[PDB]
Structures are given as C-alpha cells and as structure tokens.
C-alpha cells in the first residue's frame, strides 16, 4: 500500500508475513496495477501474466530479481544439462514414454513407437493414467495470441 | 467412521467378494476399542468399565474406569478385590467388559444367541469336530 | 502452557455463545452483602468436626 502504482517489485508476499513467495526466479518481477484504499487490497500483475489481489499490508522488495537473461544461452551439451541438474534433483535425462514398455507406461509398446490413443487425458484420471497432456483445453501449434495459462 | 481396509494402494486380491476397501466395518465397537487403548497404554491398571460422554463429527469420547490392583483399599474391599486376581489382567483385551460382551453378541440368550455361546469358537468347536465313540 | 490457554479460551467461548436460561441463571448470583450474611449464618451452624462428634 506504500508503493506507487506502476512500480516494479519482486519478493512479493502473497500473505502479510509470508516473507516473500511471488516473483523470485531470476529476472522476474511483479507490476503494481492499483490500490483499493477501502478494501485495503492491492492488485498486481504476476510474471505468468495473471492479475492477483493481495492485502495492502503485504510487503514487496523494490526492483527485479537479479540473474535475468539466463535461459537465453543455449546449453549445447548433455554434460551442461548434467551439471545444471546436479544441484537440483534427480530428474534428468528424460526417457520418452513411447520408448518404454507397456508394463511401466500407458504409452509403452507397439511394433512402432506410437501413442495408440489420444494423449489428452481427463482431469479426473487416476495417478498412473494421468500422463500425456493433462486436461488440455487445446493442443497443436499456438497461432496468434498466447492465452494466459493457468486457472481462471 | 468406517474402517478402511489397510491394503496397499487399496488393491485386493482373490475373489471379488473380498475386494471392498471403504465399506467394511470393524467387528468391534468403538467403546471396546477405547477400553483396549486405555488398557494397553497403562498395564499397571485394571480396566473395569466405560461410558459415553460426548462426540464430535470426528471424535468420540469414552471415560474408562480403572482400578489399581496394588492399592490396599482395593485389596481389602470384598466388593472390588475380585479384580486383583490375575485372571482379570487385561480383561478388556479379551472382550470381557460390557462393551466386549456387547459386540460378542452376549446381550442375547436362547434362540437369538445359540451359535455364539459360550463363544463363536466354542460353538464352532462342538458343532464341527468329528466324534469317534469307542463302540460305534 | 496449553492448559492456561484452554481455560482462558473456555471463558471466552462461554461468553460468546447463546447461553440458555437454565445455565444462564447461574451467572445471576446473590449480592455481596446478602452472600456474606448467609455465609456467616451457615458458619454459625456448621457440622461437628470428627473430634467434636
């Protein structure tokens, strides 16, 4: 509430006392859209493009998160991906589901590598069946305006 | 609530008759369960009885009555010193309190309880064992 | 400690809810002076102790 509209902020508290949960990845920030002095709420634009309102008591850091521009440099090498994920978690390399056998994946098997059924699966699919394009509203190459992702 | 069958990932095996996970009910009542938890936790006491006091949507509260079998007041009382004798150790674990008798079917007598007296196993034993008379 | 918080919150919750008359009547005590006088009269006529009996 003490920050002028149009100011660029990062490390934004979703709830007062959160100690910062929004706009923390390198290069990311929020934009303050407006204040509602009656309700005591501030409306802001998140990096994803969604607009969210939080109590005006939530704290923000002035500026943008450092380290921006990282994803612009091609990795070029499997070894560079290896070192990138070394400090994160065991999630790489990635084996395609159609390269697996039907015992361990719905996409497995066949005498050609193929998904034999539509890869868009329901939101209600149980774990083990919910693989592929999960509850996709649309598929294929996005033409024209990219719609803001996430829920409504 | 009802008992959830503790199978991995809710998966059962064998005949479809045994495939239920969420709809089975524990064959003991909750009062007997509360008495058993009290008795297991404090093995130096003798559980005597219990009664309902309150319940929530999540919880049920039962007050359990327990006796210290080493207290001289208990040991010299002809009304309660029966429980000092070691045959009454953990009687709630064996379904011997009022709640245990209730879920054993022992509130009934005669033709409503013939297959469960003096116990289900006792009646099964005397109904299913092959008798070989000496001269037959 | 948990019990301190619980007794305080119990007083709060007893005040915040709608107390039916059968329970509410016990907050409508006798006045101070009559209470002292009645307590003194009862103290006059207390039972015998163990040794007096």
């Amino acid at each position: 509430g003490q920050i002028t509209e149009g100011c660029i902020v990062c490390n934004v508290e979703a709830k007062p006392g959160d100690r910062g949960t929004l706009a923390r990845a390198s290069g990311d920030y929020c934009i303050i859209i407006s204040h509602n002095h009656e309700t005591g709420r501030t409306r802001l634009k998140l990096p994803s493009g969604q607009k969210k309102s939080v109590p005006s008591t939530s704290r923000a850091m002035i500026g943008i998160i450092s380290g921006g521009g990282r994803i612009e440099k091609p990795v070029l090498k499997a070894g560079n991906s290896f070192y990138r994920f070394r400090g994160k978690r065991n999630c790489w390399p990635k084996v395609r589901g159609v390269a697996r056998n039907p015992v361990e994946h719905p996409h497995g098997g066949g005498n050609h590598q193929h998904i034999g059924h539509p890869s868009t699966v329901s939101r209600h699919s149980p774990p083990g069946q919910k693989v592929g394009l999960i509850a996709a509203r649309r598929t294929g190459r996005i033409r024209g305006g990219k719609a803001v992702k996430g829920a409504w | 609530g009802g008992r959830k069958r503790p199978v991995h990932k809710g998966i059962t095996y064998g005949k479809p008759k045994t495939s239920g996970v969420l709809g089975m009910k524990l064959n003991k009542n909750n009062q007997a369960v509360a008495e058993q938890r009290l008795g297991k936790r404090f093995g130096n006491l003798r559980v005597l009885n219990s009664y309902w006091v309150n319940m929530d949507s999540t919880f049920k509260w039962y007050e359990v009555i327990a006796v210290d079998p080493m207290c001289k007041t208990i040991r010299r009382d002809p009304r309660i010193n029966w429980i000092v004798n070691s045959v009454h150790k953990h009687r709630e674990q064996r379904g011997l309190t009022s709640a245990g008798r209730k879920h054993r079917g022992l509130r009934h007598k005669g033709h409503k309880a013939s297959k469960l007296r003096p116990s289900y196993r006792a009646a099964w034993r005397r109904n299913n064992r092959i008798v070989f008379l000496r001269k037959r | 400690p948990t019990f301190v918080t619980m007794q305080r919150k119990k007083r709060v919750l007893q005040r915040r809810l709608k107390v039916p008359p059968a329970l509410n009547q016990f907050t409508k005590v006798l006045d101070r002076a009559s209470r002292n006088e009645a307590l003194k009269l009862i103290k006059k006529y207390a039972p015998e102790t163990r040794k007096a009996r």
């Binding site: - | - | 005040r15 915040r16 008359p21 009547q25 006088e37 009645a38 307590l39 009269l41």
Partner: protein
C-alpha cells in the same frame, strides 16, 4: 459438572423453598469447614437467628424466588469482546452521517 445442581433451582421453585445462587463453592466449603460444597440447606436455627433467617429469606426471595418468570425466560451470552465492541463503535462513527442526504426533510 454443572449437571449436579443445574436442576436444583427448579426443584426449589417447585416446592416453594427459598434459594440463593452464590459465588464460589469453595467459600461454601469454607463455611462448613470443608474444601468445597455444592449446596447447603438450613433446616432450623435458634431463636437468636430467626430474625436474621427471615431477613435473609426476604432478600434471597427478591433476587431469586419472586423473579421466576424472568429467570425462566432469560437467555444469556451473545457478548462481544472489547476489540469487537470498539470496532463497531468506530465503524458507526465513521459512517455517522453517510445517508443524511437520503432523507427527504
């Protein structure tokens, strides 16, 4: 538990026995020389205290026996904290005359 004596004022009222609800079962226990006491009944006193007993009966009846309709009718509780009452006060003060122009006169 309050259920031990929750019925006692009603039983006293039904039999037309003067009763008082007083503070602190521990003070009652102090009177009879005990730790606590739920209730005490006076059956008779000597002549030196007949007048005191009668005056006590009168004031006790004023508070309790004569007020049976109110006592039977009166719901309690519904009390706000100090912070809530002050907040309602401040709100009524802020919106003290917002609708003054809506009035025809």
């Amino acid at each position: 538990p309050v259920e031990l004596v929750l019925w006692m004022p009603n039983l006293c009222r039904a039999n037309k026995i003067p009763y008082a609800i007083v503070k602190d079962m521990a003070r009652l226990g102090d009177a009879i020389g005990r730790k606590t006491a739920t209730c005490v009944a006076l059956t008779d006193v000597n002549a030196e205290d007949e007048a005191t007993l009668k005056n006590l009966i009168r004031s006790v009846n004023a508070r309790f026996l004569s007020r049976s309709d109110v006592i039977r009718r009166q719901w309690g509780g519904l009390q706000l904290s100090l912070r809530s009452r002050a907040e309602l006060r401040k709100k009524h003060a802020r919106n003290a005359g917002v609708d003054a122009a809506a009035i025809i006169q």
